Design a protein around this ligand. Structure first.
Ligand SMILES: NC(=O)C1=CN([C@@H]2O[C@H](COP(=O)(O)OP(=O)(O)OC[C@H]3O[C@@H](n4cnc5c(N)ncnc54)[C@H](O)[C@@H]3O)[C@@H](O)[C@H]2O)C=CC1
Ligand SMILES: NC(=O)C1=CN([C@@H]2O[C@H](COP(=O)(O)OP(=O)(O)OC[C@H]3O[C@@H](n4cnc5c(N)ncnc54)[C@H](O)[C@@H]3O)[C@@H](O)[C@H]2O)C=CC1
Ligand SMILES: NC(=O)C1=CN([C@@H]2O[C@H](COP(=O)(O)OP(=O)(O)OC[C@H]3O[C@@H](n4cnc5c(N)ncnc54)[C@H](O)[C@@H]3O)[C@@H](O)[C@H]2O)C=CC1
Ligand SMILES: NC(=O)C1=CN([C@@H]2O[C@H](COP(=O)(O)OP(=O)(O)OC[C@H]3O[C@@H](n4cnc5c(N)ncnc54)[C@H](O)[C@@H]3O)[C@@H](O)[C@H]2O)C=CC1
Ligand code: NA
Ligand code: NA
Ligand code: NA
Ligand code: NA
Ligand code: NA
Ligand code: NA
Lengths: 406, 404, 404, 406
């Protein structure tokens, strides 16, 4: 089983989760509690699930990504007492039903991936809301949705946004999301990136990482944006900025990373050159309008696994990766094992934080406590065998005084 | 044209934001009747900031951030332009302080401070300044830390805007901003190879990271020291090696301090350095590298080169210090690229105008630069570069604010 | 379309030079009446090279470079196109050799070799091949070394063109050519973080340098091992750390061999590796990392992942090997980018045409690819990209050839 | 004296020359011989001169770069018995006379920098040719001139081209010439390079290093060439290639590194944008036609030290660095100390090689012997405390055999 092998592989390179398991498996702090999860299911996230289980939690999972009927990772999890609900295709109806099945187990805590499970809890299953003590949300898209929910006054449980900690800087780095995205694009196209015009839509944490990686690969990077401050940063970073309607005319690759909808229009698409490659790095598959592609294409064909060709009225053919879905997850390895280990440790401690403090907390979206960022950093340094400096007594006094040393 | 005027002429063709600001307020002269007191590194770029404020109607009174960094020809050019200048390049500390007092004796309405010196003096020794001071714009992290400490003791009386910490400090402290100017200063004064050398950067905040990223771009083996676990992990994830300074000094070819702290190197650390090691400070005050310690423990002290002091030690080894432990990119370099300072200065002018407009509704505390100023300056920059960007549609606006 | 045909379809839209060559010789069919025997990694890109030669009139007979790397659907697609294919993906060594013999039994006029195997067999065991063989085009450094050794013994009988060593090996072995395909193969099969890890690259010739440069671009701490002082100094000047392999293995997270030599890791070196170390070979033959040694000294051997073998040792530590010590970018990756292979293959077609035209005036020795072929292919590439360059004037030509 | 200080500074960071002096100063192998040199004179080259003197040679120097009348380095050299002829301005007449003065001393060996001293020896001072036993030429331009001289059959002494060894790769590297060039441009302009269009004319060893450094600084690099192979390499390296007449229309910086003449034409110059900066990295000041600039400029003014402004008929103003002369030497530090140490060790051993073998050698241009490259590399590793691997007996047999291991 590649799946059991992959879980064993992953476990060997997730030192933080291993440390957490070794530290708390005997005390089992989550014993008697149920953690529900909506996540992209594969070996890495399976290990998060397993760690929570070792800590005593009853884990209930729903995988958003379609899985083969005898998926090795799902089976490994089930053999450990972990419940796993999956779907076979991108059928929204089944996806909704699977979310409901997780809620049917009345989770005490939820680890959400985009805010779906939380939102549906507040709009369709209020009975579950009463037992729900807290939510840990991973993505920028999910946090945005939940902050908007809080805005209306409808939010009824504490939410910890793990997304915006001191270390989202690690997750979206050029070595985090940046490289995983380009690895998925290159492995599925075998095309040379050096010298090519790469358009990246959005220059936030995700897009910047993707743009920096492309440049490091020799690409000529072009950035599109709606925020002047971000555009200027791209320019200062050495990239070219222009409107998308202009960028598409010269694009060899177009990568969306905005977290917005319809970043490409029909007109935009009809400007692309024959052979152009499109991919989405945002959370939902609405950035590149796949429905529009389907509708205006004279013909659609499979060019390679994970790559769809679309010939248009202008006779040109453009290619889409992973049907416009999160390319690094849907057609790649997601993020490096050690990067997920870091993200997962933050999420596990967030859940423990909610367990210890949900009553004291209010039904609003909280930033991840600083103490958690520092605890994970200290553990990471320990696992690396790295030592750093400490402040001296004189330095402590210097830093808090306004008077001059002299 | 005199050399001072020539330096200013050069700079003015590459400062589009300041030029746009002058044109935009040429008629209105918003600062007419107001005195802006300044304490900054006096060179052509800062002189252009002073000239622009003067064009907006302000009476500008300026002094150097350190007498040593003051360029006399630029000062003389500013004087011929009607600007009041209290600053002469000098080693005399008493004269320096005296010049800060002269600026305060002009009772400025607003102060553009560099290190918090004018503001601290105003709240402790020269409170008469408080009869007319309405707000302060502070440029450096060190200044902000000092003013927050002043606030904490309850002595602060006017609002302070930290232009420092903004959405555009990612530009000032960029590898292409502070990073490159720091390395240009080091390379021009040592002519030493950077590729393959062990470069120790103390501190991994904005300044140190830019410095470390540039060193790596030059081929160095970068080692970062820190006291904050989160920053240390950040450096490791950026690809750098992290270890305690006491271990780093044993293999260092270069040690650059960028912490904003004092005594980053101990006497013991110094005695562990190898012969020929080069030390430089990129932090605001000359306390990061203990210059007094080097002086005391050295058997011999000599000029090895212009801007480079050699200290031969009890262990027979000699180590070298650039610019007497002072801010290296400014004391032995060009500061920052012109276009980078143009942006920073546009932000400072709008900070002063923002104080002029809202100081009465602000408490005596440190305020982060308002977001609308960042956006305003960014749009001016895009306009100046002739760059067009996209605009959200109604569907997109609805999408972004929806939770479904 | 069948999957083999689909793979070839994809590749053909991104191979402009091969497409230009087909169009350029469509009528002439210069290779009509000639058989070109091939031994190469059988995938879509090499299949397109075969198809292009067929379009120039050649009877093409091809076999895999290693049965394991042969893609059966691509092979079947080639057969449906009239090309003779002797190659089935297999672990059986005897069947592999048998397939090389079948290619030789077609008595090729020209051979495109990969590692010198066909050529060596032709000059030692199957000399009947020499009744019709007129020239060989060898792609790899290892092949060239072997054929030069064959030449040295006096057994070589036909001219050999080393397409390898040319003005455009700087492209094939570029950080964007071999470098990135090597790392994509390693990252896709381990999903391990590269930034901050110790990456040991054994050998600093063209291949190793590209690999080291890409590793550094990914944030790795790169360590290079070498036996040639000039190459070691080169690595140091490029910014890398250099040390003996016996010291490098103690801290290595990754060890990549790119030397073209045998036993780059000793048993002692292997027992010094840390638990979890990852080993991969980018050299032509699977002898760089001693696979037989790992097998013999291992207490446990298991599949850790697809393309990854785990070997638990007597010291209780486990080390991992990618693709059984075989050429990693080919055995567990996509080889090289399409456009890179298009260039390499254009050079090989012109090498064969050059042999067709000049083999009688060439000795049985290894010849570097003729410079005019490099220029011809470069012009075709510029034309294809629609790039225009400058042209020397009469004054400039006179200047360049003048000594005054 | 900054000059004596600078010589002392340089000596501390030139481990190879120090090793050479320590090794041979007692034997003084060059005792009784005269080494004439035509070089750019500053602290670093002074140290080459001093090392030869410590080895026993009578050194006679002529500095091509104008020097102040009481130049500290020249005075330091004279106080050591080294003869130094200098000029005060860019007066060709005085430059020629200084070359003659070096020849007047009848050197046994010549270290040339551009081929001038050697060429004039073969066309005006044949009496000196008889005693001249060999020449070591440093630059690409000088080697080209001397190879052309050999071509006519006029060459009468052995010439070792140090330029084309295994290590010209170190001298022209992005960290060698590349960075020194950009440091001179940035220190003399204070302009931001990130985002700017940088045109580099010529993609040989020098230009490539300059282009790679510019990209590393965030520039958008544009390359011009006359050799298709080089153009393609630039493209594969991720840069844009186009004709100069087109490149100049968008250039913020134009750097010539071709070793050719008139890389910019009047028409080209009139296409430059207001504020454009021009600099030459080639050996002779003919790449950017300064005479043409002087002639067509409505007015010429000093903008900054080392920077001349030229306002043209189209009302635009363009700026030239160091009067179109080798920018990194004429307005910068040349090359890093350790890089020159390497180049100088190669040149010292070349002179010793000529001393030992000039009779056996023929009057042609020789490549630097491989043994010298390897000797300097071994010494460099030794000074760095670096150890490498050695071939095993099995490996030696493997490498020379055509048979398969299996
Ligand atoms: N593939 C992956 O592994 C990852 C995916 N993401 C997803 O990527 C998206 C963005 O992530 P972040 O960068 O953290 O959000 P962000 O807010 O930091 O960056 C979003 C940027 O997109 C720009 N933008 C919005 N609409 C645009 C449009 N129509 N055209 C051009 N630019 C536009 C915004 O101005 C903003 O600067 C989210 O959906 C997030 O969940 C985030 C991290 C990793
Ligand atoms: N040279 C220049 O042009 C510039 C200078 N600066 C100056 O550099 C200093 C830092 O600026 P920022 O990075 O914005 O401050 P910062 O607070 O953002 O980063 C400072 C870092 O130093 C670390 N640190 C403190 N003490 C340390 C020690 N003893 N050893 C190692 N690390 C230590 C802290 O943990 C922190 O991460 C200030 O003095 C600032 O005024 C800032 C920007 C540009
Ligand atoms: N994976 C791929 O796609 C490619 C593979 N190759 C293969 O890689 C190998 C080398 O290719 P090249 O770089 O062109 O050969 P090369 O001769 O140009 O460089 C080989 C280097 O390895 C060094 N070396 C030899 N034995 C060593 C040892 N025991 N330890 C450390 N260093 C050692 C040599 O001193 C030499 O500098 C060959 O097998 C070649 O066929 C070449 C190009 C691409
Ligand atoms: N500033 C410095 O420190 C250094 C200066 N140089 C000087 O730079 C020049 C070139 O050095 P190399 O790169 O070693 O010679 P090179 O022969 O390796 O490169 C010269 C390149 O310029 C191209 N070229 C010729 N004419 C051209 C034109 N009109 N337009 C565009 N491209 C053209 C050629 O095709 C060739 O690729 C020589 O004068 C050399 O002495 C060399 C090394 C360092
Ligand atoms: Na299964
Ligand atoms: Na620890
Ligand atoms: Na107030
Ligand atoms: Na022949
Ligand atoms: Na003097
Ligand atoms: Na040694």
């Amino acid at each position: 089983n590649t799946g059991e092998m992959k879980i064993n592989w992953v476990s060997r390179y997730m030192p933080l989760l291993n440390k957490i398991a070794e530290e708390y498996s005997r005390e089992k702090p989550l014993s008697g509690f149920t953690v529900g999860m909506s996540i992209h299911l594969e070996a890495k996230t399976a290990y998060l699930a397993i760690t929570l289980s070792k800590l005593g939690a009853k884990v209930v999972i729903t995988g958003s990504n379609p899985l083969s009927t005898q998926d090795d990772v799902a089976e490994a999890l089930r053999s450990k007492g972990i419940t796993v609900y999956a779907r076979r295709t991108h059928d929204e109806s089944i996806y909704r039903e699977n979310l409901m099945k997780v809620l049917d187990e009345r989770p005490d805590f939820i680890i959400d991936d985009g805010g779906d499970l939380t939102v549906i809890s507040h709009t369709e299953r209020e009975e579950v809301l009463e037992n729900l003590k807290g939510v840990s949300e991973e993505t920028t898209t999910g946090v945005r949705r939940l902050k908007a929910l809080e805005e209306t006054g409808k939010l009824r449980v504490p939410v910890i946004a793990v997304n915006d900690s001191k270390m989202k800087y690690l997750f979206d780095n050029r070595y985090g999301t940046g490289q995983s995205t380009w690895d998925a694009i290159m492995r599925n196209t075998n095309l040379l990136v050096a010298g090519k015009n790469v358009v990246v839509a959005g220059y936030g944490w995700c897009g910047r990482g993707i743009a920096l990686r492309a440049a490091g690969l020799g690409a000529r990077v072009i950035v599109t944006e709606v925020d002047p401050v971000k555009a200027v940063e791209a320019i200062m970073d050495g990239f070219t900025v222009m409107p998308m309607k202009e960028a598409v005319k010269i694009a060899d690759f177009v990568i969306t990373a905005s977290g917005n909808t319809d970043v490409l229009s029909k007109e935009d698409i009809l400007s692309l050159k024959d052979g152009a490659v499109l991919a989405n790095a945002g959370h939902f598959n609405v950035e590149i309008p796949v429905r529009v592609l389907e509708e205006i294409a004279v013909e659609k064909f499979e060019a390679r696994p994970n790559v769809t060709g679309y010939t248009l009225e202008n006779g040109k053919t453009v290619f889409l990766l992973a049907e416009g879905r999160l390319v690094n997850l849907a057609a790649g390895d997601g993020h490096p094992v050690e990067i997920m280990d870091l993200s997962f440790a933050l999420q596990i401690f967030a859940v423990l934080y909610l367990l210890e403090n949900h009553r004291k907390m209010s039904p609003k979206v909280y930033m991840l406590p600083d103490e958690i960022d520092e605890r994970v950093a200290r553990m990471k340094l320990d696992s690396l065998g790295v030592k750093i400096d400490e402040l001296t007594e004189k330095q402590r006094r210097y830093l808090r005084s306004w008077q001059h040393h002299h």
